[PDB]
DNA sequence: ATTTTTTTTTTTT
């Protein structure tokens, strides 16, 4: 938040880089590995396949 | 209501004593020679006719005709039990170290190794379920894997919907909780080939009705048919209670033994060795136009290519002409796209088309579907345009790139189209306002760049002017096919278009060579092209490849004599056609 | 077996079948020996009415259970007399007050009942299947079970998937060509709109139909069809109550059947000596009409199709159009109104020649629109249309394409198809300067094109002056007009004098008569003698040597031998006027007298 | 798949 509205278009950075993913609700041509959690056998399901994204924590417009 | 079993006896002595010596060459057994072919194991797909039961008795050549499934698994299975003597290498080292015998014991299907089909819409009517019909391709489709039985549990299949099982339906994890897990072991599961298509050929179709267009086939008879193909195919719903599988896709037209390079003739072609009777037989529909006709021979003849260099040459005639009286020159093309096979048509624009290729020409949905025209589709074959002058001027570039061969780049959407524009074309025209006025020259009378007149090997202008006695004759000949149905009488022995295409297959696999012998005299022949016509610089213009062009149709013309021996014969008619194409207006 | 009256039903059903209505008249060797095997033996509830109008009745009370027991009587009766039109036991449906489609008041539930309206949303088929037929190749038992549905009984199976591992767990499999099924269909209807109200909005209605009752026709036609009534589904216990009426015979009746046996054949072949019938049959198109018509003649007769053997065929039709304004846009209804399905267009519009390209910007359902023609009806048919002067050049290139080949061939993504047509068409008029027709030049004082020479099949003279000999010549003719347009020369009676100094009488002058020679006239195949050849050619040399001179040279643009086609193929049209299986120096004679009337 | 939109190309006297 106190980031927030204090940039406009057109400037230089040296931001935080931290990568993480997206911890998705449903997924498009996604068909890698199709599992869940799921127990064994004896005496709608979910898929997984995500994307990257960005995010930071610190500016300066140089 | 007939017994399942003994009928498998009956066939058992059908299969055994199958000897029928009904042509000197068959007392040793027929279906005994295809039981131990399948004993050579070649054949993993066996046939079956009307004829072969014809004989034997007459039910089942009427009890199956209704059913034609139980009776085909006990067909599979009768001579699965039969052996008179990479699944299936693996198996063995599956059951290599071999509860003995509770066992999940295999289905015959599992072990396919063999497979059979059999042999005899708006008529087909909705009575049909079961019955193993006939009727005589759009949207072709590709070739995917279709599964028979997942594995060891047996999970079969005859829909074409699924679902995975979970555990073990046996005894191992029965009552008892020791169990393991189970999954689809591949190196022993069993699929199958599978491809899928979807219209009536219009000759059939109701004046007021639109012609309607579904076909399943699996396994190996899969690729035997392609986008529009006239084909036969020798009924099952699909699970309010609201396709078709098949065995074999025939063509009179447009199959393997009548289309070219897809010895039979060898007893009429030791009785037939003759370059000009083509003419007495190709299109005999028209009285005279010897050369125009044989022009276009030379065009059905083909055979002349190298690729020397990483660069290949053009080795297809492209013709044009020009031209508009009596001519009729309509029905000629109408009689090439009719007889030359792999053949197409477009007009000088008409719709959907404008005689061309393809293009990503709009607000109407999204698809980028570059939609292949006949341009496109013609190569290893003829698209044959008319009144291509009235085509459009954006389009001559269209026909500039596409000219040199297998040429058309397309980079308005992203990306690099081919299309691989191999297609021999023939070009055909009218005089504007006015009927080619003799002193109105070219360009001058036409409004043509000539960059487009010039890229044609020939251009042949052909007129009639007021005989009166000329066109008695045109009136006579044409009145012999009215009053009677055969053009020429007592003449020469025409050739059927089957016959005539056969003996054009013994044309284009020759490869002709030209002795040294020409290397000279061609030159020296051609020098005068470069004199007579270059020594007054209002006559036409001349081509690098121009010459290279007669060179194309002399050694096309050895397919045809074959004997590798380009003569001086092989030119001479090749200047004399080239002559023939001009020189008609000063006379 | 319900309550046992329906046992006396049948009985009474029955009843109809011994007697001389039975033994004479209704079925037997009247239809089975012909070998149909179309099942309904058609009723008339009158007969009903007369021997058990009670039983007139039980169908209009209650028409869910009449049925079955119909069919059982037929199937009895036929079954006794034929065992061969015996092995489809089946329910074997028969034949058997109209309001409207706005006037169904809950009511007529049960009951079999007519509305009239138009076919519209004519869909798709569907099979529909009877029972199961299950052996099992363990014990090897071709068992069964029925299936049903409400829109044949009030009897539904537990109508699902087919069973298995049911009986025991055996060996437990399907088979067919033994399950049978039904075909299935479904449209709905709409009022004949003349008599509609300008407040409201018109109601339609929803139908369905079944096995042989499968669409002699096209949604947008108009046809008598009978029903009764159901209502399958529920109404918020689920969800709100809609309906359909059904159980239905067929008709038609917008058609000409024709009481026609062998006698109007014999009618035909009773004028044929009469020579010039010609005269009368060009006063055939004209009574209300100078001037032409027996050029006519031929594209009401369409043509004539000739085959090379073991080759192809040739599109055989005739078009013609030619003059100075105001008889053009009052004569072409001539042949909108007789001629069989002869169909004029708009003269400037799209959407309906030939054109498609998947204009579903609205619903976007399962169909992409794949047919937009209304020129391919004129398959074998004729047609008419204003704004030729006015047309549009995208379809001259279109026409170019027809007259020379008569196919479309068109693969704007919906498919690459092609499709046949036999057809004709004419065509409108405007010179952009009125009254110029030869002093300042014969062609183009018109405002056209010159591709079109060979393509149509005629060129002709139509001109005009008020005048000073004329004037009161055109005074007295249309007067006469007037008053031969009244009676006695209700509102307006017969008018004859001028039709009786003319020697006729309107049953000898009438359309039924008239077209007493089409429709076998339109069926026959007269083939030439020794003779056309000859004089053709030598008159052809002539017309294309020396009709190009002469202060009528600029007025002799056509010539081509595409016309020597045209030449002959008109004298065949009128070979197959009277039947002769030849043609003659008198047909010569009378095919060139178009050449004198065009300009001589 | 349709409803509420917008441009960027597709091809021009
Ligand atoms: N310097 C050269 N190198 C290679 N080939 C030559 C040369 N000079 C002439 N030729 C021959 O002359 C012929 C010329 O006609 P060509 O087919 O090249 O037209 P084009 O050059 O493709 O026209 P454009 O380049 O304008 O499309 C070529 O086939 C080529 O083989
Ligand atoms: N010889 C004639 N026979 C019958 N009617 C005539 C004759 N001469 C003139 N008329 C009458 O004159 C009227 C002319 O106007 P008309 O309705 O023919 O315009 P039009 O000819 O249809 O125009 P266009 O042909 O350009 O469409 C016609 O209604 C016609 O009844
Ligand atoms: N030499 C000829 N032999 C036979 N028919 C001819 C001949 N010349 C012209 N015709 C006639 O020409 C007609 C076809 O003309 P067409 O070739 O369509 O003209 P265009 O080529 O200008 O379209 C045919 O009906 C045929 O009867």
Not at chain 2, 327 to 349: D, E, F, P, W
Not at chain 2, 423 to 430: G, M, Q, R
Not at chain 3, 355 to 372: P, S
Request: contains cysteine; glycine residues 6%; hydrophobic residues 35%.
């Amino acid at each position: 938040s106190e980031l927030v509205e204090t940039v406009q278009a057109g400037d230089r950075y040296d931001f935080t880089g931290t990568l993480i993913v997206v911890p998705d609700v449903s997924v498009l041509a996604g068909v890698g590995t199709r599992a869940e959690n799921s127990s064994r056998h004896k005496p709608g399901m979910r898929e997984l396949n995500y994307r990257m994204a960005f995010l930071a924590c610190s500016v300066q417009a140089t | 209501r007939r017994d399942y079993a003994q009928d498998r006896e009956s066939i058992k002595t059908f299969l055994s004593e199958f000897c029928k010596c009904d042509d000197d060459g068959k007392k040793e057994f027929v279906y005994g020679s295809q039981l131990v072919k399948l004993a050579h194991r070649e054949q993993v797909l066996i046939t079956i006719d009307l004829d072969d039961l014809a004989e034997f008795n007459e039910s089942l050549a009427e009890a199956v005709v209704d059913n034609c499934r139980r009776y085909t698994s006990i067909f599979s299975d009768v001579i699965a039990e039969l052996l008179p003597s990479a699944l299936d290498v693996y198996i063995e080292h599956r059951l290599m170290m071999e509860q003995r015998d509770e066992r999940n014991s295999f289905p015959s299907e599992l072990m396919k190794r063999f497979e059979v089909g059999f042999k005899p819409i708006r008529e087909v009517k909705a009575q049909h379920i079961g019955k193993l019909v006939t009727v005589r391709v759009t949207r072709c489709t590709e070739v995917k894997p279709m599964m028979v039985v997942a594995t060891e549990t047996y999970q079969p299949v005859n829909s074409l919907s699924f679902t995975p099982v979970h555990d073990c339906p046996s005894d191992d994890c029965r009552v008892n909780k020791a169990g393991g897990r189970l999954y689809l072991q591949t190196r022993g599961s069993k699929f199958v080939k599978f491809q899928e298509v979807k219209q009536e050929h219009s000759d059939q179709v109701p004046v007021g009705h639109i012609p309607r267009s579904t076909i399943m086939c699996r396994g190996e008879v899969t690729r035997m048919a392609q986008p529009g193909d006239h084909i036969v195919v020798s009924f099952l719903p699909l699970m309010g209670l609201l396709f078709l599988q098949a065995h074999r896709i025939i063509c009179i037209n447009k199959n393997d033994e009548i289309s070219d390079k897809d010895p039979e003739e060898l007893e009429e072609l030791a009785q037939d060795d003759f370059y000009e009777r083509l003419a007495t037989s190709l299109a005999p529909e028209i009285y005279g136009h010897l050369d125009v006709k044989k022009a276009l021979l030379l065009l059905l003849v083909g055979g002349v290519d190298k690729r020397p260099d990483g660069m290949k040459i053009r080795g297809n005639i492209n013709i044009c002409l020009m031209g508009d009286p009596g001519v009729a020159k309509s029905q000629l093309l109408g009689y090439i796209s009719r007889l030359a096979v792999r053949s197409q048509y477009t007009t000088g624009r008409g719709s959907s088309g404008v005689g061309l290729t393809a293009a990503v020409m709009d607000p109407l949905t999204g698809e980028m579907t570059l939609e292949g025209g006949a341009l496109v589709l013609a190569d290893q074959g003829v698209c044959c345009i008319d009144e291509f002058d009235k085509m459009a001027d954006q389009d001559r570039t269209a026909i500039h790139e596409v000219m040199e061969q297998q040429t058309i780049s397309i980079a308005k959407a992203g990306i690099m189209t081919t299309l691989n524009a191999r297609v021999s074309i023939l070009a055909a025209a009218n005089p504007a306002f006015g009927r080619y006025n003799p002193r109105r020259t070219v360009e001058q009378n036409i409004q043509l760049p000539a960059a487009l007149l010039s890229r044609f090997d020939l251009l042949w202008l052909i007129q009639d002017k007021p005989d009166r006695d000329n066109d008695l004759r045109l009136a006579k000949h044409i009145t012999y096919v009215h009053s009677h149905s055969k053009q020429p009488p007592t003449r020469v022995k025409a050739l059927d278009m089957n016959l005539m295409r056969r003996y054009i297959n013994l044309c284009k696999r020759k490869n002709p060579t030209i002795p040294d012998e020409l290397t000279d005299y061609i030159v020296g022949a051609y020098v005068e092209l470069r004199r007579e016509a270059r020594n007054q610089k209002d006559m036409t213009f001349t081509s690098a490849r121009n010459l290279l062009g007669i060179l194309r149709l002399s050694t096309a013309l050895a397919r045809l004599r074959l004997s590798d021996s380009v003569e001086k014969d092989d030119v001479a008619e090749a200047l004399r056609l080239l002559e023939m194409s001009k020189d008609s207006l000063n006379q | 077996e319900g309550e046992q009256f329906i046992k006396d039903i049948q009985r009474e059903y029955v009843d109809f079948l011994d007697d001389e209505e039975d033994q004479g008249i209704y079925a037997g060797h009247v239809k089975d020996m012909i070998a149909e095997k179309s099942k309904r033996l058609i009723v008339n509830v009158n007969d009903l009415k007369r021997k058990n109008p009670q039983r007139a009745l039980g169908l209009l009370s209650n028409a869910a259970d009449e049925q079955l027991a119909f069919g059982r009587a037929l199937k009895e009766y036929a079954s006794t007399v034929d065992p061969g039109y015996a092995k489809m036991h089946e329910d074997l449906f028969v034949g058997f007050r109209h309001v409207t489609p706005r006037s169904l008041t809950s009511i007529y539930l049960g009951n079999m009942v007519c509305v009239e309206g138009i076919v519209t949303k004519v869909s798709l088929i569907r099979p529909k299947v009877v029972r199961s037929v299950h052996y099992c190749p363990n014990t090897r038992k071709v068992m069964e079970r029925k299936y049903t549905d409400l829109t044949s009984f009030e009897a539904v199976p537990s109508g699902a998937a087919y069973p298995t591992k049911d009986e025991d767990g055996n060996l437990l499999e399907t088979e067919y060509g033994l399950s049978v099924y039904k075909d299935h269909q479904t449209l709905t209807i709409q009022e004949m709109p003349e008599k509609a109200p300008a407040g409201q909005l018109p109601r339609s209605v929803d139908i369905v139909c079944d096995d042989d009752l499968v669409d002699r026709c096209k949604p947008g036609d108009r046809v008598q069809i009978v029903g009764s009534y159901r209502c399958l589904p529920g109404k918020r216990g689920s969800g709100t109550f809609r309906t359909v009426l059904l159980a239905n015979n067929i008709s038609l009746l917008s058609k000409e059947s024709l009481d026609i046996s062998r006698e109007d054949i014999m009618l035909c072949k009773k004028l044929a000596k009469n020579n010039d019938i010609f005269e009368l049959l060009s006063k055939s198109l004209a009574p209300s009409i100078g001037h032409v018509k027996q050029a006519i003649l031929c594209l009401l007769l369409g043509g004539v199709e000739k085959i090379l053997p073991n080759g192809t065929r040739l599109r055989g039709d005739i078009n013609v159009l030619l003059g100075d304004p105001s008889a053009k846009s009052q004569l072409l209804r001539y042949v909108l109104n007789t001629a069989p399905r002869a169909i004029p267009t708009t003269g400037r519009g799209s959407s309906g020649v030939g054109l498609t390209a998947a204009v579903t910007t609205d619903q976007e359902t399962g169909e992409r629109r794949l047919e937009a023609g209304a020129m391919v009806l004129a398959d074998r048919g004729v047609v008419c249309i204003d704004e030729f002067d006015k047309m549009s050049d995208i379809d001259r290139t279109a026409i170019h394409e027809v007259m020379e080949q008569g196919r479309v061939t068109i693969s704007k993504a919906g498919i690459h198809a092609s499709l046949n047509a036999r057809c004709s068409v004419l065509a409108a008029a405007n010179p952009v300067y009125g009254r110029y027709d030869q002093y300042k030049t014969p062609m183009e004082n018109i405002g056209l094109q010159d591709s079109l020479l060979s393509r149509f099949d005629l060129l002709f003279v139509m001109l005009d002056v008020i005048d000073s000999d004329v004037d009161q010549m055109i005074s007295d003719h249309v007067v006469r007009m007037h008053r031969y347009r009244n009676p006695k020369e209700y509102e307006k009676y017969d008018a004859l004098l001028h039709g009786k100094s003319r020697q006729r009488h309107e049953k000898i002058l009438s359309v039924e008569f008239m077209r007493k020679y089409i429709h076998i006239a339109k069926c026959m195949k007269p083939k030439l003698g020794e003779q056309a050849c000859e004089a053709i050619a030598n008159e052809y040399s002539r017309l294309r040597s020396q009709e190009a001179v002469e202060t009528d040279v600029a007025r002799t643009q056509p010539i081509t031998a595409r016309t020597l086609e045209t030449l002959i193929r008109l004298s065949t049209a009128h070979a197959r006027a009277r039947m002769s299986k030849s043609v003659t120096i008198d047909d010569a004679h009378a095919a060139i007298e178009l050449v004198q009337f065009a300009y001589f």
